[PDB]
């Protein structure tokens, strides 16, 4: 049995590996190298440009926090946009909300969706939902053109190297701000506090140039580098994204595996050194 | 340049690796394989039985939380025991407290101490402190014999495979309970919630057989498996270890890099699935 190893200049000097039960599918799409394998212990795994995007074992942590942090703070979210997110995990979580009337997903790589419909049927099951509409395009362009505004935008992107490069700059955050309702929120994947402080400071400074409250939360998830990933959390009101406005009690949420009301606000209590780095931005 | 890889049956199907700048020292001690290397990006690294024990980059997270969670809850801790902990990181953190009069450390492997005094001078600097006393012995035996009781016991052990095997059983938790003052506390390293749920349930059930409050906290630290490690948190009073009783404001604590008053209680807000697994113990 072979192992998959995740090496990158974005985390020099370190690497995480998973043992491979069987390779299921590989291709070069228009944008990226796509790999799907059944791991021995983390179930099926999706890899893009040699970087792990999800595993069936842990995806609920990242999908649940990126979705339910903002969707419990937004009072009556009607219209939601997922940027990236072709696997459908964020959509799945979104569909549990009966009040949502529309979910747009802008994913640059349709291969990611199709692979997910084929190989990840419990992650991609929300594409059957009549409220979901799919747009295959660079979100940087989608957001320059979309006429609707959203109650929430969830930026479920890959890393800055690759097609997500257009998503980690001051310009993209202007577009997001413009595309949100006046009391709308955006959460975005915003890397690891252990090694990406320069990036975190940059993104925070980008968000703070527009949003009146910018917060950063941290998720434990073992298959992203350093075992955590942050949520850059952008609020147009002074009040922010640290306190949920509801609890998830209907039968659709009985299945939740990470998110709950308390660990929502916990995620925002950050390490001392991180607070000190970002305090003068 | 070579890489160090951390493979183990304790986390089958996964592995973390660090790139090696230079090997500094290796030996087989009486108890374990000892490796010290300068990594390219995480500074110097100490490895025991092929398992990473610490790196200079991140050790403050684990040392600060394991120390300051209980030392801010204990009102006037006079006498403290570190189990394991030969690197001295816990001692270092302990020494900052002027009120502490004595620190006993029971470390089974004196090689770990000596290597740490030689190679990790900013971790091991607390051994110069006149209040520190060192005992080279199996803590399982030390705690069967010690006549003093402690205000806090910090169990800074390696994993259950190896000499720490004696530290992860119902018997060891009885000894700890006996060795603590009536309002004394114990925190112990208690593995990763992503893969060690069976162990976490076992340890919790062990602790709950004696202690009236048993809590579990989680730390982000990239160089332990799954990027987190838990703190099993044992309180003889109903009140527990989730809320600090003081803030660390004197000049000795200006240097803190992870711990603070808020992220102390945050660490105890756990993922949904973990709460459900442990609810009927
Ligand atoms: C699969 S997903 C994240 C894994 C956990 N849901 C990351 C997606 O972001 C897409 N991505 C990357 N850059 C962009 C842009 N610029 N636009 C839209 N989608 C993008 C990429 O193709 C992945 O499918
Ligand atoms: C270096 S330390 C942890 C790394 C972060 N401080 C873990 C120590 O626990 C010791 N250890 C393991 N088992 C025992 C027992 N049974 N007793 C005392 N110390 C032990 C082991 O030799 C390490 O030095
Ligand atoms: C969603 C996501 C987060 C981090 C990395 N590295 C890739 C993907
Ligand atoms: C302290 C410590 C925690 C976890 C592992 N794996 C080793 C050492």
From TrEMBL, chains A, B:
<dbReference type="GO" id="GO:0004766">
    <property type="term" value="F:spermidine synthase activity"/>
</dbReference>
<feature type="binding site">
    <location>
        <position position="156"/>
    </location>
    <ligand>
        <name>spermidine</name>
    </ligand>
</feature>
<keyword id="KW-0808">Transferase</keyword>
<comment type="similarity">
    <text>Belongs to the spermidine/spermine synthase family.</text>
</comment>
<dbReference type="Pfam" id="PF17284">
    <property type="entry name" value="Spermine_synt_N"/>
</dbReference>
<feature type="domain" description="PABS">
    <location>
        <begin position="1"/>
        <end position="236"/>
    </location>
</feature>
<dbReference type="InterPro" id="IPR001045">
    <property type="entry name" value="Spermi_synthase"/>
</dbReference>
<dbReference type="Pfam" id="PF01564">
    <property type="entry name" value="Spermine_synth"/>
</dbReference>
<dbReference type="InterPro" id="IPR035246">
    <property type="entry name" value="Spermidine_synt_N"/>
</dbReference>
<dbReference type="GO" id="GO:0005829">
    <property type="term" value="C:cytosol"/>
</dbReference>
<dbReference type="InterPro" id="IPR030373">
    <property type="entry name" value="PABS_CS"/>
</dbReference>
<keyword id="KW-0620">Polyamine biosynthesis</keyword>
<dbReference type="InterPro" id="IPR037163">
    <property type="entry name" value="Spermidine_synt_N_sf"/>
</dbReference>
<dbReference type="InterPro" id="IPR029063">
    <property type="entry name" value="SAM-dependent_MTases_sf"/>
</dbReference>
<dbReference type="GO" id="GO:0008295">
    <property type="term" value="P:spermidine biosynthetic process"/>
</dbReference>
<feature type="active site" description="Proton acceptor">
    <location>
        <position position="156"/>
    </location>
</feature>
<protein>
    <submittedName>
        <fullName>Spermidine synthase</fullName>
        <ecNumber>2.5.1.16</ecNumber>
    </submittedName>
</protein>
<dbReference type="InterPro" id="IPR030374">
    <property type="entry name" value="PABS"/>
</dbReference>
């Amino acid at each position: 049995k072979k192992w998959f190893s995740e090496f990158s200049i974005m985390w020099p000097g370190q690497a995480f590996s998973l043992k491979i039960k069987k390779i299921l599918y590989e291709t070069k799409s228009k944008y990226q190298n796509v790999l799907v394998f059944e791991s021995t212990t983390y179930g099926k795994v999706l890899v893009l440009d040699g970087v792990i995007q999800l595993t069936e074992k842990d995806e609920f942590a990242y999908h649940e926090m990126m979705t339910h942090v903002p969707m419990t703070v937004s009072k009556e979210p009607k219209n939601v946009l997922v940027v990236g997110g072709g696997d459908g995990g964020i959509i799945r979580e979104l569909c549990k909300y009966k009040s949502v009337e529309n979910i747009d997903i802008c994913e640059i790589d349709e291969t990611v969706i199709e692979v997910s419909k084929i190989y990840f049927k419990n992650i991609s099951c929300g594409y059957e939902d009549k409220r979901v509409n799919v747009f295959i395009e660079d979100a940087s362009k989608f957001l320059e053109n979309v006429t609707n505004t959203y109650d929430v935008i969830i930026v479920d992107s890959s890393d800055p190297i690759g097609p997500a490069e257009t998503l980690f700059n001051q310009n993209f955050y202007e577009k997001i701000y413009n595309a949100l309702k006046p009391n709308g929120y955006c959460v975005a994947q915003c890397e690891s506090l252990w090694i990406h402080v320069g990036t975190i400071k940059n993104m925070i400074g980008y968000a703070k140039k527009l949003f009146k409250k910018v917060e950063y939360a941290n998720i434990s998830i073992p298959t992203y580098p350093c075992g955590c990933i942050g949520i850059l959390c952008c609020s147009k009101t002074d009040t922010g994204l640290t306190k949920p406005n509801k609890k998830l009690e209907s039968k659709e949420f009985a299945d939740l595996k990470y998110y709950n009301y308390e660990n929502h606000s916990a995620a925002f209590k950050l390490p001392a050194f991180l607070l000190k780095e970002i305090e003068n931005i």
